[PDB]
Amino acid sequence: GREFGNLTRIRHVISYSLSPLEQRALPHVLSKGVPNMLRRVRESFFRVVPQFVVFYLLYTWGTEEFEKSKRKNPAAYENDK
């Protein structure tokens, strides 16, 4: 079936490659890779983060409320006698 002899039909594309032993494995990290990671974080920040911030607010609120609910109310004894 699917085999490297007849996958698709292409015309007029040229490629060039070096061998691994001719070139470096980690050529430019701090001059190219770091800024690229930075933009890659920039492009997705506001699509992911705010939902989790909202989750954090909800969690803390619900915890606080549950913990208030367990403390004794002075009006339950002071009001009528």
Partner: protein
């Protein structure tokens, strides 16, 4: 609801810190002379003390102190004999109904995993042992209960089990309640998890190895993928 135990600075809590075996040796005396009246420790035997705080001969000596049932003999009858290394610490009661009958309806639990079966571990137990006090105003206790804020409910059947000079340690340490509690707690830690020290020993090695193998294999990957990472294309139609 129950009061949250504070964190005490236990010397074995570091990532690669071992247990203090002196404290184990003293805690075990506490568990002989006091705590093995009510409580069972069904999953520990004398052979387990060998190489931890005792030689084989001295552990046999401990064993020898106790009578144990055995048989049948050649006549078909049971008998009593002195203990051996392969015998389990003896039970205080024959059955749980008898245990309840001797403690006004309450059943003392088995302390073989008490430190792993409670929230807070040895912080809780210490807190429980040192923590008895007189009740607040408005509170009352039914027949045969004590007050203790670190118990869920604050009413507990167990009377305060330890006090100063309730025993004497063979190494001359002064037997204040606090010292006794800390030591028995160390001993319960050891009873719940014998593999502790060897586990940390073994972590150092194989973690060093697995940490080493990451950058090496990453380098191999980068080597194989450089062919594609630097590839250059062009489009040249006759136009």
């Amino acid at each position: 609801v129950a009061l949250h135990p504070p964190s005490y600075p236990w010397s074995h809590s570091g990532f690669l810190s071992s247990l203090d075996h002196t404290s184990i040796r003293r805690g075990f005396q506490v568990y002989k002379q006091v705590c093995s009246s009510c409580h069972s420790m069904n999953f520990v035997a004398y052979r387990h003390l060998v190489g931890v705080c005792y030689t084989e001969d001295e552990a046999k000596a401990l064993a020898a102190e106790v009578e144990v049932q055995d048989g049948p003999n050649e006549n078909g009858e049971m008998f009593m004999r002195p203990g051996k290394l392969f015998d389990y610490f003896p039970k205080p009661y024959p059955n749980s109904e008898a245990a309840r009958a001797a403690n006004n309806g309450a059943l003392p639990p088995d302390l073989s995993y008490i430190a792993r079966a409670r929230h807070g571990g040895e912080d809780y137990i210490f807190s429980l042992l040192t923590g008895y006090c007189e009740p607040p105003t408005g509170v009352s206790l039914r027949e045969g209960l004590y007050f203790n804020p670190y118990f869920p409910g604050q009413a507990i059947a167990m009377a305060p089990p330890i006090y100063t000079d309730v025993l004497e340690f063979d190494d001359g340490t002064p037997a204040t309640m606090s010292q006794i509690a800390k030591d028995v707690c160390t001993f319960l830690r050891w009873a719940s998890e014998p593999e502790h020290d060897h586990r940390k020993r073994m972590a150092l090695k194989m973690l060093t190895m697995m940490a080493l193998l990451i950058p090496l294999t990453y380098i191999m990957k980068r080597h194989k993928w450089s062919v594609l990472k630097s590839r250059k294309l062009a489009y040249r139609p006759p136009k």
